[PDB]
Amino acid sequence: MREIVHIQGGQCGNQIGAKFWEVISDEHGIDPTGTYHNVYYNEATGGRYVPRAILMDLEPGTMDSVRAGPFGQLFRPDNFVFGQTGAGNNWAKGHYTEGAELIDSVLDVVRKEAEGCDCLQGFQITHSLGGGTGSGMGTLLISKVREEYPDRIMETFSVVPSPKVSDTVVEPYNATLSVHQLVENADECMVIDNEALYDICFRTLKLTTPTYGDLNHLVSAAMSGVTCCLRFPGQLNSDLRKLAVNLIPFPRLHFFMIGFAPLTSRGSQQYRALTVPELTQQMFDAKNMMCAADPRHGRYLTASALFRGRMSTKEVDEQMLNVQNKNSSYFVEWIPNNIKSSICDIPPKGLKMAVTFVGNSTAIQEMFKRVAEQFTAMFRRKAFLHWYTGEGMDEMEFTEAESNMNDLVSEYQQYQDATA
């Protein structure tokens, strides 16, 4: 009932997915051999629990890298459909040539996983906005499935270009080519940036030696906590659609920031208490979120908070009221009770409380400002274009894509000010 298909893509998507299945396993008590010592997994004759997923990438090396780590035996040997030539970070490579020759079988196996369920509530994507493979094949698969299943919902946990340094110097082009098709056929664009996770694992945890394993573990905890109030009992349950209405007021302004709580180092863990006050303070903490945009420099159209643990509710409601009546300026006022709460009955393994915060704010419009700026700069000089036209794609598209981006921010800032 209310299942979730696990579509992957790109090496980042594959790593984050491996870590996410690791977390779901050691929460649902599934040891990496695939036993127990329907929302996600699938029963398998012989007493196994094969996780319902699919992994796509133009390199079969990520195959062996993800099967090498523990909890790799969970993934069935059949879902690993991988391309050969590799896209080399070229949007057209992963969206026009290699796309139109493997995405066929991708859709075939996705449908096979789909009909096998009874109520496929929503999708789930793990990929990137930079790489050709990830961005390209991901947006193409999303367009295809949203033409396939117009009733279901969409969600993409996408990593975006960090502001300070960039991973692949053509990040703006692939980013805008992914956002020009994502903004139309996607409902929950959970944006993440590597710099925010860096600052989190350093400042708020004193961990001096962060590795991509730990960062992926943090984003895993976020993704899990997103829906954990569904597959568990709770004094007030929600799902992946009550969020959508409590989160998006419009067909476009649906790009969410993400935050998790609680997180503290070895030192400061002995002192600090643990009650709804502290969880709230870490929740609305500026740096605690996983977005390279301090939300204090904008407002929130809305925000939801899915708690976890058997705790009170008057504390929840009165602290929502307090954080809304004290930080009212940083909230927007043309909407009443612009926050939403939800409560479950199981905290994560090892604590007694948890918070997963999701925010439909107007502070990422700054991120889109910087992306459009980079695009205009690297475009007026036609920089790195003969890769994007030597593979059956005209510059025209590119231009209009940026136009669309403009309209996007042209909305956000607008609703920041308008009142009644």
Ligand X SMILES: Nc1nc2c(ncn2[C@@H]2O[C@H](COP(=O)(O)OP(=O)(O)O)[C@@H](O)[C@H]2O)c(=O)[nH]1
8 is a contact residue toward ligand X (CB under 6 A): no
Site string for ligand X, 29-68 (x = CB under 6 A): ----------------------------------------
Cβ 323 to ligand X shortest distance, Å: 29
Residue among 157, 156, 419, 416 nearest 301 (CA): 416
**Which partner, ligand X, another protein, none, binds residue 89 by CB below 5 to 8 Å per kind?**
ligand X
Report the Cα–Cα distance between both ends of the chain, in Å, rounded: 42
Q: Could you tell me the maximum CA-CA distance found in the chain, to the nearest angstrom? A: 62
Residue 59 marked as a ligand binder: yes
Residue 208 marked as a ligand binder: no
C-alpha dihedral, 223 to 112 to 55 to 89, nearest 10°? -110
Cβ 29 to another protein shortest distance, Å: 19
Which parts of 116-241 fold into alpha helices (H)?
Answer: 138-148, 171-182, 194-203, 212-227
Residue 133 marked as a ligand binder: yes
Alpha-carbon span 337 to 329, nearest angstrom: 14
Cβ 226 to ligand X shortest distance, Å: 17
309 is a contact residue toward ligand X (CB under 6 A): no
Q: Locate 56 and state its tokens.
A: 């796509």
Site string for ligand X, 109-128 (x = CB under 6 A): -------------------x
Residue 128 marked as a ligand binder: yes
Cβ 352 to another protein shortest distance, Å: 9
Residue 132 marked as a ligand binder: yes
Alpha-carbon span 196 to 194, nearest angstrom: 6
167 is a contact residue toward ligand X (CB under 6 A): yes
CB within 8 Å of 276: residues ≥ 6 apart: 311, 312, 315, 316, 319, 353
Contact with ligand X (CB under 6 A): which of 5, 8, 15, 49? Answer: 15
Which one, 202 or 212, has the nearer CB to ligand X?
212
Contact with ligand X (CB under 6 A): which of 17, 34, 131, 298? Answer: 131
CB within 8 Å of 60: residues ≥ 6 apart: 80, 82, 83, 84
**Which partner, ligand X, another protein, none, binds residue 8 by CB below 5 to 8 Å per kind?**
none
Which one, 197 or 405, has the nearer CB to ligand X?
197
The secondary element (H helix, E strand) that includes residue 128 is: strand 125-128
Which one, 93 or 340, has the nearer CB to ligand X?
93
Residue among 121, 92, 255, 100 nearest 184 (CA): 255
**Which partner, another protein, ligand X, none, binds residue 350 by CB below 5 to 8 Å per kind?**
another protein
The secondary element (H helix, E strand) that includes residue 51 is: strand 48-51
**Which partner, another protein, ligand X, none, binds residue 87 by CB below 5 to 8 Å per kind?**
ligand X
What is the DSSP annotation of 248-313?
A: -SSSS--EEEEEEE----SGGGTTS--SHHHHHHHHH-TTTBSSSS-GGGS-EEEEEEEEESS--S
Contact with ligand X (CB under 6 A): which of 126, 133, 246, 338? Answer: 133
Residue 133 DSSP one-character state = I
202 is a contact residue toward ligand X (CB under 6 A): no
Cβ 139 to ligand X shortest distance, Å: 12
Which one, 4 or 196, has the nearer CB to ligand X?
196
Contact with ligand X (CB under 6 A): which of 8, 25, 79, 89? Answer: 89
Cβ 49 to another protein shortest distance, Å: 28
* Other CB atoms within 10 Å distance of the CB of residue 38: 14
**Which partner, another protein, ligand X, none, binds residue 270 by CB below 5 to 8 Å per kind?**
another protein
Residues contributing to the site for another protein (CB under 8 A): 266, 269-270, 350
Alpha-carbon span 376 to 368, nearest angstrom: 12
Residue 134 marked as a ligand binder: yes
132 is a contact residue toward ligand X (CB under 6 A): yes
Say if residues 357 and 259 touch (Cβ distance below 8 Å): yes
CA 354 to chain centre: 19
212 is a contact residue toward ligand X (CB under 6 A): yes
Contact with ligand X (CB under 6 A): which of 51, 134, 172, 309? Answer: 134
Q: Which residues lie near ligand X (CB under 6 A)?
A: 10-12, 15, 87, 89, 128, 130-134, 159, 167-168, 194, 197, 212, 215-216
- Bind-site residues for GTP: 11, 59, 128, 132-134, 194, 216
